[PDB]
């Protein structure tokens, strides 16, 4: 049963929601791989009327690239609880989000016969706290 039920880290998105950049540079070093532009939608008063327009960058890290990052990110954060997803995720911070899920997630991300993950096989906030808390730190 377990082993295929035990949580794991799938991507950590580090993005800097600026309002118009030079910031990529630091993201590249803090993570270790190229950042991506962040176009925006809708025309708005913050002199942000331009539809297609660089307004920040993000970086999606997977596998070691994600751990090796969290092995310094997490320490710079304290928070926990309430600040967690209903799906077992959590964002802290410049933003750093951690998407968590169990072994058979590809089923919902592949092209052929894809499907949504059953609520039972989903990751709960609690089952999430455990996994991470059980990895160099404390909850609440």
For other proteins, the binding residues (CB under 8 A) are: 111-115
Nearer to other proteins, 2 or 112 (CB): 112
Residues that bind RNA (CB under 7 A): 1, 3-5, 10-11, 33-39, 51-52, 58-63, 65, 102-107, 109-115, 117-121
Is there a contact between 28 and 61 (Cβ–Cβ < 8 Å)?
no
Q: Measured from the CB of residue 115, what is the shortest distance to other proteins in angstroms? A: 7
Distance between CA atoms of 19 and 38, rounded to whole angstroms? 10
Name which of 29 and 111 has its Cβ closer to other proteins: 111
């Amino acid at each position: 049963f377990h082993e295929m039920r035990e949580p794991r880290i799938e991507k950590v998105v580090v993005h800097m929601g600026i309002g118009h950049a030079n910031a990529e540079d630091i993201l590249g070093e803090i993570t270790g791989q190229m950042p991506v532009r962040t176009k925006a939608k809708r025309t708005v008063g913050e002199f942000d009327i331009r539809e297609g327009d660089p307004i920040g960058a993000k970086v999606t890290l997977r596998d070691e690239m994600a751990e090796e990052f969290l092995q310094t990110a997490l320490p710079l954060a304290e928070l926990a609880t309430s600040q967690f997803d209903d799906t077992g995720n959590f964002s802290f911070g410049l933003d750093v989000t951690v998407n968590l899920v169990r072994p058979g997630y590809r089923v919902a991300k592949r092209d052929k016969a894809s499907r949504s993950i059953p609520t039972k096989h989903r990751l709960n906030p609690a089952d999430a706290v455990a996994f991470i808390e059980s990895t160099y730190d404390v909850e609440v």
